[PDB]
Design a protein around this ligand. Structure first.
Ligand SMILES: C=C(CC)C(=O)c1ccc(OCC(=O)O)c(Cl)c1Cl
Ligand SMILES: C=C(CC)C(=O)c1ccc(OCC(=O)O)c(Cl)c1Cl
Ligand SMILES: [Ca+2]
Ligand SMILES: [Ca+2]
Ligand SMILES: [Ca+2]
Ligand SMILES: [Cl-]
Ligand SMILES: [Pt+2]
Lengths: 208, 208
C-alpha cells in the first residue's frame, strides 16, 4: 500500500524507511536515476519539484516530514496525548533544522565548511541530550515512553553525524546509549544491516 | 492561556498571531529587545537558542511550526481526518520551504540576491495556486472545507511576498481571491488593520 519514489540514496528517506521497517510494514521502492530526473518530466509533475514522493494508496505526498507525520499519525507513533504530540513536533523541527545545515554542508560547502561545522556540532546536538535527560533520565524515547516518528528521524540524524564526525556522541552519554538501544530493536537492527540499506550511499554526491 | 515571547517584529509569529486573533483566542505578548537578547540569559534558556518561545499553561514550546501544529491540533484547525491532516502538513512544509528562502534573502543576501529571488518567485508560488485549483475550485481553504493552521501560514507567506514583489499574485486568480477572502474574515480583518500588526516591521533588519 506504500510506495517510496526516490533517488538511489538514503538521504531524506532513511528515517521513514527505518520507521516502516521497524513497524513491520511492507513497501515498494521506485528508484529515480539522475538521468530520469534530468529529463525533467517527473520533476515537473512533483508538487514542489522535488523527491521524495510517497504514495499511500491513492494519497500522494511530498515533503519528508509530511511523510513522517502521516505515518506517525496512522501508525500511532505521535505521542499518547496532545501535549506529547507537540513535544514530538518540537523534537522533529529541531532535527529538521540540523538536517538542513548538514545538507548545506554536504552539497554546497563540504571542503571549506567542515571544520567549522564539526566545531559547532556539540552545540547543535546538546538540545537532544537535554530532552533525553528531562525524560525518564534518557532511558526510553525522545518523548514519553513509546517510540515516535521523531525517534526515527533523530536516530537517522545521529547516525549520519557519527559518519561525518566519528565520536561526536562521546560528549553525549544519553544520545550515545539511545543510538545503541534503538539500533538494537530487532526489526530495525535487521534492516540497518540489510543490502537495501547498506548498499545505498547516505547522500547523492559521494560525500559523508 | 497563551504567551508569545518574541522580538518586536512580525517574522515567524505573524501566522500564529493571525490564527489566534481569527479564532478569538486571548494571548499575552512578551516583547524581547535587542539588549535583552544580547545579554545571553534568555537565549541560553531556549531549547534551540531561538525565539519564539510559547507558553500554554505549563506547556512550553519552541519552533514556530510546532506552535502552529499545536494550536491546529487543540483548536481543530488540522483538517477533517488523517488524509486531510497529511495534506495540511504538505502545504505547511511547502510554505516553510519558501519562508526559509525568503529569510535567507532578507537576512544574508538582500542586495545581491533580490533579482534572482523575484525572477524565481512565480515558480515558487504556482504550487499553491495548483493546490487551490484542485480543492473545490479554490473557493474554500488550502485543504478541505475548513480553515487550517496552514491557511494562516500561507496567507502570511503571500502577504509578505506582495510587499517584496508587488503584483506577484496577479497571474494567480485563485491565490489572489483567497488572500482577499481570508483577509476579509471579520476578526482577522480587525487584527490586520490594528497597530499591533501594522506598526511592527515584518523583519528585524529593516528589509522587506
Ligand atoms: C540527484 C541529485 C540532483 C538533484 C543529487 O545529487 C541530490 C541533490 C540534493 C539532495 O537533497 C537535498 C535535500 O534537501 O534533501 C539529494 Cl537527496 C540528491 Cl540525491
Ligand atoms: C535578533 C536579530 C539580530 C539583530 C534579528 O534582527 C533577527 C534575526 C533573525 C530572525 O529570524 C528570522 C525569522 O523570521 O525566522 C529574526 Cl525574527 C530577527 Cl528579529
Ligand atoms: Ca522541505
Ligand atoms: Ca526551525
Ligand atoms: Ca475546524
Ligand atoms: Cl529550507
Ligand atoms: Pt532551511
Amino acid at each position: 500500500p506504500y510506495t517510496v519514489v526516490y533517488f538511489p540514496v538514503r538521504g531524506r528517506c532513511a528515517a521513514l524507511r527505518m520507521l516502516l521497517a521497524d513497524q513491520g510494514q511492507s513497501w515498494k521502492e521506485e528508484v529515480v536515476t539522475v538521468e530520469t530526473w534530468q529529463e525533467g518530466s517527473l520533476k515537473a509533475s512533483c508538487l514542489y519539484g522535488q523527491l521524495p514522493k510517497f504514495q499511500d494508496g491513492d494519497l500522494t505526498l511530498y515533503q519528508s516530514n509530511t511523510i513522517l507525520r502521516h505515518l506517525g499519525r496512522t501508525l500511532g507513533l505521535y505521542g499518547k496525548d496532545q501535549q506529547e504530540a507537540a513535544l514530538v513536533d518540537m523534537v522533529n523541527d529541531g532535527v529538521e533544522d540540523l538536517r538542513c545545515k548538514y545538507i548545506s554542508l554536504i552539497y554546497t560547502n563540504y571542503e571549506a565548511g567542515k571544520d567549522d561545522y564539526v566545531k559547532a556540532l556539540p552545540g547543535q546536538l546538546k538540545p537532544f541530550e537535554t530532552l533525553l535527560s528531562q525524560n525518564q533520565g534518557g532511558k526510553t524515547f525522545i518523548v514519553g515512553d513509546q517510540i515516535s516518528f521523531a525517534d526515527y528521524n533523530l536516530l537517522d540524524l545521529l547516525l549520519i553525524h557519527e559518519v561525518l564526525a566519528p565520536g561526536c556522541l562521546d560528549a553525549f552519554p544519553l544520545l550515545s546509549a539511545y543510538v545503541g538501544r534503538l539500533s538494537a530493536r530487532p526489526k530495525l537492527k535487521a534492516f540497518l544491516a540489510s543490502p537495501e540499506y547498506v548498499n545505498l550511499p547516505i547522500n547523492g554526491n559521494g560525500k559523508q
